[PDB]
C-alpha cells in the first residue's frame, strides 16, 4: 500500500507486557542495611501508573538475592510473543552496578543478561526497560545556584536503563513522599504517556528531580544536596506507550 515508516517500536501486540516491581524494604539484620522507609509509596505509585499504561503488573516484596535471580530467570523463560515490551522496576539499596537483595547484593548485569537478544527470544527486537531506584555509590551533588558489506542485531540492543541517579552518586528517598525519581517518573508518565515519546518523558523526569528537590538534613554532610537521574539508552527505535 502507501509509504511505510518503521521508526517506532510496534506497541500494538495483544498485550503491553509485564511490569515486574521488586520492592525491597526490610533487609536481613546481618547485612547492616537500613529499612527503606517510603518505598511502599513508590511501589504503589508504580503499580497504578503501569496499570494505567495497560501493563500486567506483578509486585514482589522483600526478595533475597536468590529469589531475585530465580524470578528474573523464570520471567525470561516465559513466552512473551504476544507482549509488546518488558518493564522491570528495582527499588532497593545499591552501589555502582549492584542492587541489593534482602540478604546480599546482585550484579545488575546478572539480572539484565537473562533478557539479552539471544537469551530471551520472545523479547528480541522489543524494548526492555529497567527502572532502577538505588544508590550508585556515595557521592553527593552539592549543586549550583541559578566497500559495502550487507541479518543480526546486538544482544545488548533494545535495552533502556532509567537510573535514578548519576554514576557514583547516592540516590535520595523521602520517608513520607517516596523517592524523588519514582515520584517524578510516575507524575510524568501520568501526564505525558499519551502525548510524548519515552526519552522526552524521561527528560522531563530529569528536570523535575533536578529542580523541585533538595535534601534537608541536620547533618551538614547530607544537607542541601541535589540529584540528577541518568537515562541510559540502547534503544534502536522511538518508544510510545500508545498506538494508532
Amino acid at each position: 500500500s502507501g509509504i511505510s515508516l518503521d521508526n517506532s517500536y510496534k506497541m500494538d501486540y495483544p498485550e503491553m507486557g509485564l511490569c515486574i516491581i521488586i520492592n525491597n524494604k526490610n533487609f536481613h539484620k546481618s547485612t547492616g542495611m537500613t529499612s527503606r522507609s517510603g518505598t511502599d509509596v513508590d511501589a504503589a505509585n508504580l503499580r497504578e501508573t503501569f496499570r494505567n499504561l495497560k501493563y500486567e503488573v506483578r509486585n514482589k516484596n522483600d526478595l533475597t538475592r536468590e529469589e531475585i535471580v530465580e524470578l528474573m530467570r523464570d520471567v525470561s523463560k516465559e513466552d512473551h510473543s504476544k507482549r509488546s515490551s518488558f518493564v522491570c522496576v528495582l527499588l532497593s539499596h545499591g552501589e555502582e552496578g549492584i542492587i541489593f537483595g534482602t540478604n546480599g547484593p546482585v550484579d545488575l548485569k546478572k539480572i539484565t543478561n537473562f533478557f539479552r537478544g539471544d537469551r530471551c527470544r520472545s523479547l528480541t527486537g522489543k524494548p526492555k526497560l529497567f527502572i532502577i531506584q538505588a544508590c550508585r555509590g556515595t557521592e553527593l551533588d552539592c549543586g549550583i545556584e541559578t566497500d559495502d558489506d550487507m541479518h543480526k542485531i546486538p544482544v545488548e540492543a533494545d535495552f533502556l536503563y532509567a537510573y535514578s541517579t548519576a554514576p557514583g552518586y547516592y540516590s535520595w528517598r523521602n520517608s513520607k513522599d517516596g523517592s524523588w525519581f519514582i515520584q517524578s517518573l510516575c507524575a510524568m508518565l501520568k501526564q505525558y504517556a499519551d502525548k510524548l515519546e519515552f526519552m522526552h518523558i524521561l527528560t522531563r523526569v530529569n528536570r523535575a528531580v533536578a529542580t523541585a528537590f533538595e535534601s534537608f538534613s541536620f547533618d551538614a554532610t547530607f544537607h542541601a544536596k541535589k540529584q540528577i537521574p541518568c537515562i541510559v539508552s540502547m534503544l534502536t527505535k522511538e518508544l510510545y506507550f500508545y498506538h494508532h
Binding site: 538505588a134 544508590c135 528517598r173 547530607f222
Partner: peptide
C-alpha cells in the same frame, strides 16, 4: 530525606 534518606539515601539508598
Amino acid at each position: 530525606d534518606e539515601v539508598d
